[PDB]
Amino acid sequence: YNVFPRTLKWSQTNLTYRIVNYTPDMSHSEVEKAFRKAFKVWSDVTPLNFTRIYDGTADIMISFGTKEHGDFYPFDGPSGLLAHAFPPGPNYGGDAHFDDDETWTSSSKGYNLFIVAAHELGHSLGLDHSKDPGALMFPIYTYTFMLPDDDVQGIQFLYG
Numbered sequence: 001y002n003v004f005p006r007t008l009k010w011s012q013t014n015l016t017y018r019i020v021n022y023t024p025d026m027s028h029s030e031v032e033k034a035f036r037k038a039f040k041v042w043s044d045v046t047p048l049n050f051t052r053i054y055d056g057t058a059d060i061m062i063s064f065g066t067k068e069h070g071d072f073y074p075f076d077g078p079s080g081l082l083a084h085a086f087p088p089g090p091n092y093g094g095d096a097h098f099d100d101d102e103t104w105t106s107s108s109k110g111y112n113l114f115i116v117a118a119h120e121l122g123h124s125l126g127l128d129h130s131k132d133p134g135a136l137m138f139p140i141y142t143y144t145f146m147l148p149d150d151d152v153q154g155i156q157f158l159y160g
């Protein structure tokens with residue numbers, strides 16, 4: 001596993017997240033279940049706790065956008081770039097963006113939202129990409145859930 005320069009991590013163990021908008025190809029309920037499961041993957045192995053808020057600014061703002069969407073990481077339409085997230089810190093730190101031009105699903109037909117979200121949240125928590133091919137933080141999409149050992153070691157190094 002790998003961490004970001006200066007080992008970025010959250011100072012508090014009680015973090016908030018907010019789903020700003022939704023993708024059209026999935027019902028609001030399935031999008032919410034996807035993220036709920038994504039956060040659980042990480043809360044189960046760390047002393048971290050996540051609370052979903054609906055108004056205001058949360059520690060982790062989740063949004064869907066297309067092409068140019070407000071930052072220095074524009075999307076590229078169907079396929080290619082799927083999503084990106086920012087490491088722990090103020091402002092957009094911790095935020096996760098998902099390409100709305102993708103066909104997100106709860107199954108395995110298109111790009112599974114849960115698995116991508118789980119990967120992105122790893123970044124939101126302080127983990128950079130891993131060199132271990134079987135790690136969730138490996139930079140390649142492959143959907144077949146139990147968090148691989150490399151990821152557990154990495155996240156527990158930061159918050160354990």
Ligand SMILES: O=C(CC1(S(=O)(=O)c2ccc(Oc3ccc(Cl)cc3)cc2)CCOCC1)NO
Nearest residue numbers: 081082083084115116119136138139140141142
């Ligand atoms: O790493 C990225 C972006 C890309 S990605 O958009 O293609 C991408 C995002 C999340 C992914 O998640 C998973 C990783 C591993 C497994 Cl097993 C499942 C999902 C995969 C690719 C594109 C640029 O180069 C690295 C990969 N940020 O998370």
Ligand SMILES: [Ca+2]
Nearest residue numbers: 077078079081
């Ligand atoms: Ca894309």
Ligand SMILES: [Ca+2]
Nearest residue numbers: 059089093094
């Ligand atoms: Ca933040």
Ligand SMILES: [Zn+2]
Nearest residue numbers: 069071073097
């Ligand atoms: Zn973005």
Ligand SMILES: [Zn+2]
Nearest residue numbers: 119123129139
């Ligand atoms: Zn990544």
